[PDB]
Amino acid sequence: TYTISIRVYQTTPKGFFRPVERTNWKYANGGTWDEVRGEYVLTMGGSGTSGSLRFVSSDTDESFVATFGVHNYKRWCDIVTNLTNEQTALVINQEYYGVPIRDQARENQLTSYNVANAKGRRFAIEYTVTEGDNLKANLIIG
């Protein structure tokens, strides 16, 4: 059993990102999202699946989907921003298992990733514990 426990950091009072969606991919017996001691915890039965979180800032018309998983026993992550209204986390989560560019992001098995939106704001995932059964990550909103 894997857990990925995520701490969210909003670094500037410019805009306000709120959680709006949390999804689980169907592989490796699925998985769950729990809130535990102020953290978002993704639990998976083993390697080969993932889950996504979407955050929205209605004040500034900004949003992103952050995806976390394990591929061949190594943690991975990605962030997608500049979302269309059709790009919910339900949509994005699935793309990592069929869309070549997204497949590659998962295959990269990154301990850290960052991307900025068209408005200039950067988002980052940083795994602080990168090995073992209880992985930990910071989700940093710039």
Asked if residue 95 binds a second copy (CB under 8 A), the reply is no
Site string for a second copy, 1-40 (x = CB under 8 A): ------xxxxxxx--xxxxxxxxxxxx-xxxxxxxxxxx-
Nearest residue to 5 via CA among 94, 141, 108, 138: 138
Neighbouring residues of 1: CB distance < 8 A, sequence distance ≥ 6: 43, 44, 45, 46, 133
134 lines the binding site for a second copy (CB under 8 A): no
Would you count residue 99 as binding a second copy (CB under 8 A)?
no
Residues numbered 104-123 forming contacts with a second copy, rule: CB under 8 A: none
Among 3, 67, 81, 93, binds a second copy (CB under 8 A): 93
d(CA 62, CA 56): 6
